[PDB]
Amino acid sequence: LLDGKGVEMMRDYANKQLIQMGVKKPETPEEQQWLVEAQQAKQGQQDPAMVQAQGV
């Protein structure tokens, strides 16, 4: 999309969303630690059913 002010924010949000799921290849280092934080969030995910099963 073209650039105004709000649509700039929406395009930045779409940028971050596309980078964070690994679909895009980051070029600018901002996207680089965006992907880094996405990977950190992915590695720190766990579901209650798995934990209960492991406890059993």
Next chain:
Amino acid sequence: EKQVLNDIRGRYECYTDVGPSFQSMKQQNRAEILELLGKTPQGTPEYQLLLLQYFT
């Protein structure tokens, strides 16, 4: 005391098209946000665009 503008030769960075007549940039941004809102289904981007419409 006369100020002389200094414009670099990197000036023709945008081309000309034809669109609806708007009295200000804010009106154009509002129209673009409304146009995007009319095609986005009621998910998370719909909420984003509604908040962006209340923005401007």
Next chain:
Amino acid sequence: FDVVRPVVRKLVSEMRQNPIDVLYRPKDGARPDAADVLMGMYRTDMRHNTAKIAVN
């Protein structure tokens, strides 16, 4: 006994309900917000009554 004037009035009304204005878009490979300043300036100094009257 005029019979052409209603047609002229209808055509003028039809063209009046559909305003057309310039729209600057960034060139290919240019920054996505390359045309924001120029568009803002154009909307600033073309919103007056003289421009609309001249176009009409």
